[PDB]
Amino acid sequence: PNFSGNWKIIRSENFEELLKVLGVNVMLRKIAVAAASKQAVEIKQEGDTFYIKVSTTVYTTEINFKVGEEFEEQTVDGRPCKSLVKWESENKMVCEQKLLKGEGPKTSWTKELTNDGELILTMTADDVVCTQVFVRE
Ligand SMILES: *C/C=C(C)/C=C/C=C(C)/C=C/C1=C(C)CCCC1(C)C
């Protein structure tokens, strides 16, 4: 696998529906959908160690993890969580998250490198799956 690269979003499906499950009110959902269309992802992968920078026009976040080791990040709506990433196949990984405080929908994400060279990210809250597709810059 080589997830390493600079990725630009080409498609974003069901993101508003995900935010709605997560309690985000309608105007903020619409503005977040617009922000998501400018999403860029930078990945550096060394073996099972990942550095990931996700950004939009006015915001940027760095995610560092090693597969199989718990780390801390935030859910989509912005709540701190404990995350754990495992491989599901050669080029797909899945992250399960657990809220640090309180309760809420069950969230997770997946990252996949397809044969055709796309990066597919999925983000899930309960029953609702958002799918985002990227290509290399
Ligand atoms: C491997 C790639 C990952 C884990 C990407 C995660 C992406 C996000 C947490 C994106 C979040 C965003 C929002 C919550 C609001 C709209 C802007 C986004 C898409 C950057």
Side-chain angles (χ1 to χ4, degrees), residues 86-94 110-112:
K86 303 184 186 195
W87 298 104
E88 181 194 295
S89 60
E90 182 177 359
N91 288 302
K92 184 163 179 175
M93 73 198 68
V94 49
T110 69
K111 181 192 303 308
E112 178 184 15

Side-chain angles (χ1 to χ4, degrees), residues 100-111:
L100 281 188
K101 305 236 197 92
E103 288 103 63
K106 203 235 269 266
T107 57
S108 60
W109 60 257
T110 69
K111 181 192 303 308

Side-chain angles (χ1 to χ4, degrees), residues 3-109:
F3 284 88
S4 286
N6 301 283
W7 299 91
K8 61 178 181 180
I9 193 159
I10 57 153
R11 245 214 314 303
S12 183
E13 296 179 273
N14 260 277
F15 190 48
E16 183 180 359
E17 291 86 339
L18 182 80
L19 297 177
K20 191 180 181 183
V21 175
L22 293 163
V24 182
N25 280 342
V26 56
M27 184 177 320
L28 275 315
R29 301 198 300 261
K30 300 305 190 176
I31 286 157
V33 168
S37 75
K38 305 294 190 123
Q39 200 177 341
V41 177
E42 173 185 350
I43 300 177
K44 309 183 189 203
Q45 177 190 3
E46 302 171 340
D48 273 350
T49 300
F50 288 79
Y51 159 84
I52 300 170
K53 186 150 108 305
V54 185
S55 64
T56 49
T57 305
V58 304
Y59 206 87
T60 179
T61 303
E62 282 169 321
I63 299 164
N64 292 268
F65 67 85
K66 170 158 180 260
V67 172
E69 304 187 356
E70 194 182 276
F71 65 106
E72 191 187 312
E73 58 172 339
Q74 316 204 148
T75 69
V76 174
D77 55 307
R79 297 168 80 179
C81 61
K82 282 309 169 97
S83 288
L84 179 57
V85 172
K86 303 184 186 195
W87 298 104
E88 181 194 295
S89 60
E90 182 177 359
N91 288 302
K92 184 163 179 175
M93 73 198 68
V94 49
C95 185
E96 302 294 341
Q97 301 173 318
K98 307 302 143 206
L99 285 179
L100 281 188
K101 305 236 197 92
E103 288 103 63
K106 203 235 269 266
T107 57
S108 60
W109 60 257

